Scaffold this active site. Structure first.
Site, PDB file in Angstrom:
ATOM      1  N   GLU A  16      25.733 -67.809 -44.298  1.00 53.28           N
ATOM      2  CA  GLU A  16      24.408 -67.816 -43.686  1.00 53.28           C
ATOM      3  C   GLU A  16      23.754 -69.260 -43.170  1.00 53.28           C
ATOM      4  O   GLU A  16      23.031 -69.180 -42.429  1.00 53.28           O
ATOM      5  CB  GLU A  16      23.459 -67.279 -44.935  1.00 53.28           C
ATOM      6  CG  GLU A  16      23.625 -65.967 -45.330  1.00 53.28           C
ATOM      7  CD  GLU A  16      23.123 -64.976 -44.329  1.00 53.28           C
ATOM      8  OE1 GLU A  16      22.999 -65.051 -43.080  1.00 53.28           O
ATOM      9  OE2 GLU A  16      23.623 -63.839 -44.610  1.00 53.28           O
ATOM     10  N   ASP A  25      18.994 -64.409 -35.480  1.00 54.74           N
ATOM     11  CA  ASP A  25      20.139 -64.381 -36.304  1.00 54.74           C
ATOM     12  C   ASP A  25      21.198 -63.352 -35.166  1.00 54.74           C
ATOM     13  O   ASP A  25      20.729 -63.355 -34.130  1.00 54.74           O
ATOM     14  CB  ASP A  25      19.964 -63.263 -37.414  1.00 54.74           C
ATOM     15  CG  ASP A  25      19.541 -61.882 -37.088  1.00 54.74           C
ATOM     16  OD1 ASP A  25      19.653 -61.619 -35.999  1.00 54.74           O
ATOM     17  OD2 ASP A  25      19.274 -61.164 -38.204  1.00 54.74           O
ATOM     18  N   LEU A  62      15.675 -62.967 -43.183  1.00 57.84           N
ATOM     19  CA  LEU A  62      15.021 -62.286 -41.933  1.00 57.84           C
ATOM     20  C   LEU A  62      13.333 -62.288 -41.858  1.00 57.84           C
ATOM     21  O   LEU A  62      12.829 -62.491 -42.925  1.00 57.84           O
ATOM     22  CB  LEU A  62      15.403 -60.649 -42.054  1.00 57.84           C
ATOM     23  CG  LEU A  62      14.854 -59.926 -40.909  1.00 57.84           C
ATOM     24  CD1 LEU A  62      15.474 -60.147 -39.591  1.00 57.84           C
ATOM     25  CD2 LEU A  62      15.099 -58.347 -41.111  1.00 57.84           C
ATOM     26  N   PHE A  76      22.963 -58.271 -49.298  1.00 53.68           N
ATOM     27  CA  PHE A  76      22.107 -59.277 -48.613  1.00 53.68           C
ATOM     28  C   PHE A  76      22.257 -59.373 -47.189  1.00 53.68           C
ATOM     29  O   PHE A  76      20.868 -59.312 -46.526  1.00 53.68           O
ATOM     30  CB  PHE A  76      22.786 -60.751 -49.274  1.00 53.68           C
ATOM     31  CG  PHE A  76      21.849 -61.778 -48.586  1.00 53.68           C
ATOM     32  CD1 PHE A  76      21.758 -62.472 -47.501  1.00 53.68           C
ATOM     33  CD2 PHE A  76      20.972 -62.398 -49.813  1.00 53.68           C
ATOM     34  CE1 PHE A  76      20.991 -63.448 -47.200  1.00 53.68           C
ATOM     35  CE2 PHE A  76      20.160 -63.635 -49.568  1.00 53.68           C
ATOM     36  CZ  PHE A  76      20.381 -64.155 -48.351  1.00 53.68           C
ATOM     37  N   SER A 135      34.436 -46.360 -49.102  1.00 51.98           N
ATOM     38  CA  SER A 135      34.624 -47.602 -49.463  1.00 51.98           C
ATOM     39  C   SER A 135      34.229 -47.712 -50.753  1.00 51.98           C
ATOM     40  O   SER A 135      35.098 -48.006 -51.779  1.00 51.98           O
ATOM     41  CB  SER A 135      34.237 -48.822 -48.567  1.00 51.98           C
ATOM     42  OG  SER A 135      34.571 -48.520 -46.913  1.00 51.98           O
ATOM     43  N   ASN A 158      39.640 -49.566 -45.293  1.00 54.17           N
ATOM     44  CA  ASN A 158      38.212 -48.656 -44.953  1.00 54.17           C
ATOM     45  C   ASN A 158      37.188 -49.628 -44.512  1.00 54.17           C
ATOM     46  O   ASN A 158      36.467 -49.171 -43.709  1.00 54.17           O
ATOM     47  CB  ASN A 158      38.026 -47.958 -46.137  1.00 54.17           C
ATOM     48  CG  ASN A 158      36.914 -46.767 -45.605  1.00 54.17           C
ATOM     49  OD1 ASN A 158      35.707 -46.966 -46.102  1.00 54.17           O
ATOM     50  ND2 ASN A 158      37.273 -45.787 -44.882  1.00 54.17           N
TER      51      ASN A 158
END
Length: 170
Positions: free
Chosen positions: A11, A20, A32, A104, A117, A132
């Protein structure tokens, strides 16, 4: 290495309001702020998150505080989710980190959508899960980050740490 260090790498750190990978207003360590196109709206959200008139700028400590809150919430999100919880519980410590990373970045809802998955992960079919996982918009949009995470799930090691999408807001 740990979840905090992991996410900080993925990040990065910005003390000023930024956009972003998806063009959404964000700040700090991938916090965010809003999906809305208004800088003003973003500023409002910021002030509200911080508890003061920021003017689009925050301190390092403030960013870290948001960060801790954000990590905490991702985990809580996992524990409250009936599809997530069982997987998370079945995983070793390193792999759990990978799960948290995804949540996250894309939200509990986004992750919960990775049904196949998740099942493979629950079954410990590492290689298969990896294949996958890569067949996703996620991988195609933020390949480098996805790669690191996928590799983590695959090996159960931090090697990939030896491309940011989302994280908490309006």
């Amino acid at each position: 290495m740990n979840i905090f260090e992991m996410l900080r790498i993925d990040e990065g750190l910005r003390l000023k309001i930024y956009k972003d990978t998806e063009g959404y207003y964000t700040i700090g360590i991938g916090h965010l702020l809003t999906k809305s196109p208004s800088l003003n709206a973003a500023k409002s959200e910021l002030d509200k998150a911080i508890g003061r008139n920021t003017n689009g700028v925050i301190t390092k400590d403030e960013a870290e505080k948001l960060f801790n809150q954000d990590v905490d919430a991702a985990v809580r999100g996992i524990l409250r989710n009936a599809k997530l919880k069982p997987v998370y519980d079945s995983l070793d410590a390193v792999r759990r980190a990978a799960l948290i990373n995804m949540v996250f970045q894309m939200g509990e809802t986004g992750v919960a959508g990775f049904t196949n998955s998740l099942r493979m992960l629950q079954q410990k079919r590492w290689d298969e899960a990896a294949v996958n996982l890569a067949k996703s918009r996620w991988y195609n949009q933020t390949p480098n980050r996805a790669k690191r995470v996928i590799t983590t799930f695959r090996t159960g090691t931090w090697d990939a740490y030896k491309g940011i999408g989302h994280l908490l807001t309006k």
